[PDB]
């Protein structure tokens, strides 16, 4: 069984959308059973909270199921996940820092955007943005998750 953890700073705006998009893709391809899919935060700012309601509104428009309770990444996650796919370089710095504090790091840690055929490298925090910024995040997750599923690097 393969595993991927999507990560952003708070686990309310970006990573729950990536997770939900990816889970839908594998489910549509009859292989959800082969995959462990999750999302988590670098920080503890939003622990226990559901995804940003603007994100829920976006996913509803696109007919993508989403349900998550925000949680912080743990030391155990570096041992168990094949891939940790994050949103921006700040996430990446933080994840690399945490990963070096741990004995076992199975996970390949990289930017989700590094999979975008369109080379939109960074998935920017839409929290201080509007609905159009959530839509961009959504569209990025679609391209990136599809490409990741196709061929992980």
PDB file of C-alpha atoms in Angstrom:
ATOM      1  CA  UNK A   1       0.000   0.000   0.000  1.00  0.00           C
ATOM      2  CA  UNK A   2       1.290   3.475  -0.971  1.00  0.00           C
ATOM      3  CA  UNK A   3       0.977   6.616   1.146  1.00  0.00           C
ATOM      4  CA  UNK A   4       0.963  10.385   0.713  1.00  0.00           C
ATOM      5  CA  UNK A   5       0.598  13.194   3.222  1.00  0.00           C
ATOM      6  CA  UNK A   6      -0.215  16.684   1.912  1.00  0.00           C
ATOM      7  CA  UNK A   7       1.099  19.474   4.118  1.00  0.00           C
ATOM      8  CA  UNK A   8       0.567  23.205   4.515  1.00  0.00           C
ATOM      9  CA  UNK A   9       1.068  25.658   7.383  1.00  0.00           C
ATOM     10  CA  UNK A  10      -2.325  25.293   9.041  1.00  0.00           C
ATOM     11  CA  UNK A  11      -4.028  22.326   7.337  1.00  0.00           C
ATOM     12  CA  UNK A  12      -7.226  24.353   6.702  1.00  0.00           C
ATOM     13  CA  UNK A  13      -6.873  26.038   3.279  1.00  0.00           C
ATOM     14  CA  UNK A  14      -4.532  24.122   0.946  1.00  0.00           C
ATOM     15  CA  UNK A  15      -3.616  20.616   2.086  1.00  0.00           C
ATOM     16  CA  UNK A  16      -7.199  19.484   2.804  1.00  0.00           C
ATOM     17  CA  UNK A  17      -8.029  20.364  -0.790  1.00  0.00           C
ATOM     18  CA  UNK A  18      -5.028  18.445  -2.130  1.00  0.00           C
ATOM     19  CA  UNK A  19      -5.956  15.455   0.009  1.00  0.00           C
ATOM     20  CA  UNK A  20      -9.572  15.501  -1.124  1.00  0.00           C
ATOM     21  CA  UNK A  21      -8.642  15.928  -4.783  1.00  0.00           C
ATOM     22  CA  UNK A  22      -6.115  13.072  -4.613  1.00  0.00           C
ATOM     23  CA  UNK A  23      -8.515  10.735  -2.767  1.00  0.00           C
ATOM     24  CA  UNK A  24     -11.166  11.364  -5.440  1.00  0.00           C
ATOM     25  CA  UNK A  25      -8.677  10.603  -8.230  1.00  0.00           C
ATOM     26  CA  UNK A  26      -7.650   7.248  -6.732  1.00  0.00           C
ATOM     27  CA  UNK A  27     -11.260   6.406  -5.847  1.00  0.00           C
ATOM     28  CA  UNK A  28     -12.348   7.115  -9.433  1.00  0.00           C
ATOM     29  CA  UNK A  29      -9.625   4.719 -10.569  1.00  0.00           C
ATOM     30  CA  UNK A  30     -10.734   1.873  -8.297  1.00  0.00           C
ATOM     31  CA  UNK A  31      -7.482   2.045  -6.330  1.00  0.00           C
ATOM     32  CA  UNK A  32      -8.395   3.984  -3.166  1.00  0.00           C
ATOM     33  CA  UNK A  33      -7.753   0.744  -1.256  1.00  0.00           C
ATOM     34  CA  UNK A  34      -4.114   0.803  -2.393  1.00  0.00           C
ATOM     35  CA  UNK A  35      -3.545   4.278  -0.972  1.00  0.00           C
ATOM     36  CA  UNK A  36      -3.283   5.868   2.439  1.00  0.00           C
ATOM     37  CA  UNK A  37      -4.105   9.584   1.950  1.00  0.00           C
ATOM     38  CA  UNK A  38      -3.921  12.321   4.601  1.00  0.00           C
ATOM     39  CA  UNK A  39      -3.157  15.982   5.248  1.00  0.00           C
ATOM     40  CA  UNK A  40      -1.463  17.749   8.151  1.00  0.00           C
ATOM     41  CA  UNK A  41      -0.047  21.122   9.220  1.00  0.00           C
ATOM     42  CA  UNK A  42       3.496  22.259   9.960  1.00  0.00           C
ATOM     43  CA  UNK A  43       2.007  24.380  12.777  1.00  0.00           C
ATOM     44  CA  UNK A  44      -0.519  23.971  15.584  1.00  0.00           C
ATOM     45  CA  UNK A  45      -2.483  27.098  14.660  1.00  0.00           C
ATOM     46  CA  UNK A  46      -5.678  25.395  13.531  1.00  0.00           C
ATOM     47  CA  UNK A  47      -5.662  22.023  15.252  1.00  0.00           C
ATOM     48  CA  UNK A  48      -9.124  20.479  15.462  1.00  0.00           C
ATOM     49  CA  UNK A  49     -10.631  22.785  12.852  1.00  0.00           C
ATOM     50  CA  UNK A  50     -12.392  21.774   9.616  1.00  0.00           C
ATOM     51  CA  UNK A  51     -11.164  23.087   6.259  1.00  0.00           C
ATOM     52  CA  UNK A  52     -11.673  26.798   5.524  1.00  0.00           C
ATOM     53  CA  UNK A  53     -15.326  27.230   4.606  1.00  0.00           C
ATOM     54  CA  UNK A  54     -14.239  29.001   1.406  1.00  0.00           C
ATOM     55  CA  UNK A  55     -12.395  25.812   0.513  1.00  0.00           C
ATOM     56  CA  UNK A  56     -15.486  23.772   1.257  1.00  0.00           C
ATOM     57  CA  UNK A  57     -17.503  26.056  -1.031  1.00  0.00           C
ATOM     58  CA  UNK A  58     -14.983  25.589  -3.811  1.00  0.00           C
ATOM     59  CA  UNK A  59     -14.975  21.783  -3.454  1.00  0.00           C
ATOM     60  CA  UNK A  60     -18.772  21.714  -3.435  1.00  0.00           C
ATOM     61  CA  UNK A  61     -18.866  23.607  -6.751  1.00  0.00           C
ATOM     62  CA  UNK A  62     -16.580  20.953  -8.222  1.00  0.00           C
ATOM     63  CA  UNK A  63     -18.390  18.011  -6.649  1.00  0.00           C
ATOM     64  CA  UNK A  64     -15.369  16.836  -4.657  1.00  0.00           C
ATOM     65  CA  UNK A  65     -16.068  15.219  -1.266  1.00  0.00           C
ATOM     66  CA  UNK A  66     -14.010  16.776   1.533  1.00  0.00           C
ATOM     67  CA  UNK A  67     -13.973  16.102   5.248  1.00  0.00           C
ATOM     68  CA  UNK A  68     -10.999  16.703   7.500  1.00  0.00           C
ATOM     69  CA  UNK A  69     -10.088  17.758  10.998  1.00  0.00           C
ATOM     70  CA  UNK A  70      -6.877  19.799  11.028  1.00  0.00           C
ATOM     71  CA  UNK A  71      -3.903  18.122  12.738  1.00  0.00           C
ATOM     72  CA  UNK A  72      -0.190  18.849  13.084  1.00  0.00           C
ATOM     73  CA  UNK A  73       2.399  16.649  11.427  1.00  0.00           C
ATOM     74  CA  UNK A  74       4.105  14.318  13.903  1.00  0.00           C
ATOM     75  CA  UNK A  75       7.531  12.673  14.051  1.00  0.00           C
ATOM     76  CA  UNK A  76       5.775   9.382  13.232  1.00  0.00           C
ATOM     77  CA  UNK A  77       4.590  10.744   9.861  1.00  0.00           C
ATOM     78  CA  UNK A  78       8.157  10.912   8.528  1.00  0.00           C
ATOM     79  CA  UNK A  79       8.551   7.202   9.230  1.00  0.00           C
ATOM     80  CA  UNK A  80       5.243   5.984   7.760  1.00  0.00           C
ATOM     81  CA  UNK A  81       4.545   8.045   4.619  1.00  0.00           C
ATOM     82  CA  UNK A  82       6.173   7.401   1.242  1.00  0.00           C
ATOM     83  CA  UNK A  83       5.651  11.013   0.208  1.00  0.00           C
ATOM     84  CA  UNK A  84       5.143  14.275   2.006  1.00  0.00           C
ATOM     85  CA  UNK A  85       3.967  16.839  -0.513  1.00  0.00           C
ATOM     86  CA  UNK A  86       3.894  20.464   0.691  1.00  0.00           C
ATOM     87  CA  UNK A  87       2.596  23.782  -0.681  1.00  0.00           C
ATOM     88  CA  UNK A  88       5.354  26.395  -0.486  1.00  0.00           C
ATOM     89  CA  UNK A  89       9.082  26.806   0.217  1.00  0.00           C
ATOM     90  CA  UNK A  90       8.350  27.884   3.791  1.00  0.00           C
ATOM     91  CA  UNK A  91       6.562  24.554   4.398  1.00  0.00           C
ATOM     92  CA  UNK A  92       9.540  22.846   2.817  1.00  0.00           C
ATOM     93  CA  UNK A  93      12.120  24.557   5.067  1.00  0.00           C
ATOM     94  CA  UNK A  94      10.041  23.634   8.101  1.00  0.00           C
ATOM     95  CA  UNK A  95       9.510  20.026   7.046  1.00  0.00           C
ATOM     96  CA  UNK A  96      13.222  19.565   6.299  1.00  0.00           C
ATOM     97  CA  UNK A  97      13.997  20.973   9.751  1.00  0.00           C
ATOM     98  CA  UNK A  98      11.597  18.598  11.480  1.00  0.00           C
ATOM     99  CA  UNK A  99      12.756  15.641   9.376  1.00  0.00           C
ATOM    100  CA  UNK A 100      16.327  16.065  10.563  1.00  0.00           C
ATOM    101  CA  UNK A 101      15.189  15.707  14.193  1.00  0.00           C
ATOM    102  CA  UNK A 102      13.971  12.189  13.504  1.00  0.00           C
ATOM    103  CA  UNK A 103      15.772   8.819  13.267  1.00  0.00           C
ATOM    104  CA  UNK A 104      13.697   7.306  10.460  1.00  0.00           C
ATOM    105  CA  UNK A 105      12.634   9.402   7.474  1.00  0.00           C
ATOM    106  CA  UNK A 106      11.125   7.154   4.819  1.00  0.00           C
ATOM    107  CA  UNK A 107       9.252  10.072   3.305  1.00  0.00           C
ATOM    108  CA  UNK A 108      10.327  11.869   0.156  1.00  0.00           C
ATOM    109  CA  UNK A 109       9.623  15.508   0.986  1.00  0.00           C
ATOM    110  CA  UNK A 110       8.878  17.859  -1.914  1.00  0.00           C
ATOM    111  CA  UNK A 111       6.654  20.610  -3.246  1.00  0.00           C
ATOM    112  CA  UNK A 112       3.406  19.340  -4.687  1.00  0.00           C
ATOM    113  CA  UNK A 113       3.832  21.987  -7.397  1.00  0.00           C
ATOM    114  CA  UNK A 114       6.988  20.268  -8.596  1.00  0.00           C
ATOM    115  CA  UNK A 115       4.558  17.880 -10.321  1.00  0.00           C
ATOM    116  CA  UNK A 116       2.649  20.584 -12.210  1.00  0.00           C
ATOM    117  CA  UNK A 117       3.024  20.180 -15.987  1.00  0.00           C
ATOM    118  CA  UNK A 118       2.312  23.932 -16.142  1.00  0.00           C
ATOM    119  CA  UNK A 119       5.231  24.668 -13.800  1.00  0.00           C
ATOM    120  CA  UNK A 120       3.198  26.757 -11.314  1.00  0.00           C
ATOM    121  CA  UNK A 121       5.673  25.757  -8.613  1.00  0.00           C
ATOM    122  CA  UNK A 122       4.132  27.354  -5.499  1.00  0.00           C
ATOM    123  CA  UNK A 123       0.631  26.780  -4.159  1.00  0.00           C
ATOM    124  CA  UNK A 124       0.105  30.090  -2.415  1.00  0.00           C
ATOM    125  CA  UNK A 125      -1.775  30.557   0.835  1.00  0.00           C
ATOM    126  CA  UNK A 126      -5.279  31.811  -0.121  1.00  0.00           C
ATOM    127  CA  UNK A 127      -6.316  32.676   3.452  1.00  0.00           C
ATOM    128  CA  UNK A 128      -6.064  36.442   2.952  1.00  0.00           C
ATOM    129  CA  UNK A 129      -7.332  36.087  -0.613  1.00  0.00           C
ATOM    130  CA  UNK A 130     -10.779  35.450  -2.051  1.00  0.00           C
ATOM    131  CA  UNK A 131     -12.797  32.715  -3.757  1.00  0.00           C
ATOM    132  CA  UNK A 132     -10.720  33.100  -6.927  1.00  0.00           C
ATOM    133  CA  UNK A 133      -7.591  32.204  -4.965  1.00  0.00           C
ATOM    134  CA  UNK A 134      -9.196  29.030  -3.658  1.00  0.00           C
ATOM    135  CA  UNK A 135     -10.135  28.165  -7.234  1.00  0.00           C
ATOM    136  CA  UNK A 136      -6.493  28.557  -8.296  1.00  0.00           C
ATOM    137  CA  UNK A 137      -5.372  26.308  -5.446  1.00  0.00           C
ATOM    138  CA  UNK A 138      -7.981  23.798  -6.518  1.00  0.00           C
ATOM    139  CA  UNK A 139      -6.871  23.837 -10.159  1.00  0.00           C
ATOM    140  CA  UNK A 140      -3.227  23.462  -9.117  1.00  0.00           C
ATOM    141  CA  UNK A 141      -4.040  20.485  -6.936  1.00  0.00           C
ATOM    142  CA  UNK A 142      -5.844  18.882  -9.849  1.00  0.00           C
ATOM    143  CA  UNK A 143      -2.850  19.107 -12.223  1.00  0.00           C
ATOM    144  CA  UNK A 144      -0.316  18.201  -9.555  1.00  0.00           C
ATOM    145  CA  UNK A 145      -2.198  15.244  -8.040  1.00  0.00           C
ATOM    146  CA  UNK A 146      -2.921  13.772 -11.462  1.00  0.00           C
ATOM    147  CA  UNK A 147       0.752  14.037 -12.454  1.00  0.00           C
ATOM    148  CA  UNK A 148       1.945  12.675  -9.084  1.00  0.00           C
ATOM    149  CA  UNK A 149      -0.400   9.685  -9.390  1.00  0.00           C
ATOM    150  CA  UNK A 150       0.846   9.104 -12.950  1.00  0.00           C
ATOM    151  CA  UNK A 151       4.473   8.913 -11.932  1.00  0.00           C
ATOM    152  CA  UNK A 152       5.916   9.784  -8.563  1.00  0.00           C
ATOM    153  CA  UNK A 153       9.507  11.010  -8.507  1.00  0.00           C
TER     154      UNK A 153
END
